[PDB]
């Protein structure tokens, strides 16, 4: 008969924007 | 009596922080 | 049969580049 559903593993986000202007 | 359990797929994280001060 | 698949948790991205000089 049918089995129950199996959560997957945890990639990184993209880089942040450039820092504060000097 | 049930079948065996089915892991799901691995999303990307949020943007990184702003970089260091200029 | 085995059940259906179970998505996992979403790291923050790296810091951005240095801010522009001023």
Author numbering:
A (entry chain C), B (entry chain E), C (entry chain D): 1 to 6, 8 to 11, 13 to 24
Sentences from the paper on this structure:
Collagen is a critical structural protein in mammals.
To answer these questions, we synthesized azPro-containing CMP 1, H–(POG)2(azPOG)(PRazG)(POG)4–NH2, and determined its structure using X-ray crystallography. In CMP 1, one Pro residue from each strand was replaced with its aza-derivative azPro. This amino acid sequence was engineered to produce a homotrimeric peptide containing a total of 3 azPro residues when fully assembled. CMP 1 was synthesized on solid phase and crystallized by sitting-drop vapor diffusion (detailed procedures in ESI†). Herein, we use X-ray crystallography to provide the first atomic resolution crystal structure of an achiral aza-amino acid residue embedded within a folded protein structure, definitively illustrating that achiral aza-proline has the capacity to effectively mimic the stereochemistry of natural amino acids within the context of triple helical collagen. Taken together, these data indicate that CMPs containing azPro can still self-assemble into the biologically essential collagen triple helix and that this modification does not disturb the conformations of the peptide backbone or amino acid side chains. In this study, crystallographic data verifies that the added N atom in azPro adopts a pyramidalized conformation and that azPro is a near perfect mimic for Pro in this CMP.
